[PDB]
From Swiss-Prot:
The family this protein is said to belong to: Belongs to the ryanodine receptor (TC 1.A.3.1) family. RYR2 subfamily.
Function (record text): Cytosolic calcium-activated calcium channel that mediates the release of Ca(2+) from the sarcoplasmic reticulum into the cytosol and thereby plays a key role in triggering cardiac muscle contraction. Aberrant channel activation can lead to cardiac arrhythmia. In cardiac myocytes, calcium release is triggered by increased Ca(2+) cytosolic levels due to activation of the L-type calcium channel CACNA1C. The calcium channel activity is modulated by formation of heterotetramers with RYR3. Required for cellular calcium ion homeostasis. Required for embryonic heart development.
Upper taxonomic lineage: Eukaryota, Metazoa, Chordata, Craniata, Vertebrata
Protein name according to UniProt: Ryanodine receptor 2
Effect of loss of the gene: Embryonically lethal. Embryos die at about 10 dpc, due to defects in heart tube development. Cardiac myotubes display enlarged rough endoplasmic reticulum and cytoplasmic vesicles that contain high levels of Ca(2+).
Entry's free-text remark on domains: The calcium release channel activity resides in the C-terminal region while the remaining part of the protein resides in the cytoplasm.
Disulfide bonds: none
Length: 165
């Protein structure tokens, strides 16, 4: 996917979808009960990467930025075209829109499945350097129980792409 020059006409959309992925990375943790703390912990139910997008430094926004780039590049590589068409937290207000109403077509569902397969392949190729975790198998050879979580995580990119027009 990285062999595709990213068109700057939709860099603003790649940043909107990056901000959306970041705000949902806040959303799920706050559903689990995570606040905004200055210590990078997981058992202390706090996360220092929940603040507004503009205040996020280069050490915290690159994850969502690269995630958006790779999903869009995977879309363009597969062949379809991209173009023109509450729980009170501890300081942040993640609420883009009601993006869970319009039914997502089976083509987009398979597209999100392919995105999850690619992301899992990258993560497994990174993980093989460590021992012998049962998740070192490809996504096609992965247990079906956790397949839906990765497909759900990748569904929001195409959901934002469709909803924003």
């Amino acid at each position: 996917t990285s062999q595709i020059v990213l068109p700057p006409h939709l860099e603003r959309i790649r940043e909107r979808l990056a901000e959306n992925i970041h705000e949902l990375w806040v959303m799920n943790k706050i559903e689990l009960g995570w606040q905004y703390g200055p210590v990078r912990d997981d058992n202390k139910r706090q996360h220092p990467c929940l603040v507004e997008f503009c205040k996020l430094p280069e050490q915290e926004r690159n994850y969502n930025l690269q995630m958006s780039l790779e999903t869009l590049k995977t879309l363009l590589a597969l062949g379809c075209h991209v173009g023109i068409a509450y729980q009170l937290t501890s300081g942040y207000k993640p609420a883009p829109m009601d993006l869970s109403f319009i039914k997502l077509t089976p083509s987009q569902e398979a597209m999100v499945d392919k995105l999850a397969e690619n992301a899992h392949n990258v993560w497994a190729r990174d993980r093989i350097r460590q021992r012998r975790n049962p998740r070192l198998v490809p996504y096609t050879l992965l247990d079906d129980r956790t397949k839906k979580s990765n497909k759900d995580s990748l569904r929001e990119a195409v959901r934002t792409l469709l909803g924003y027009g």
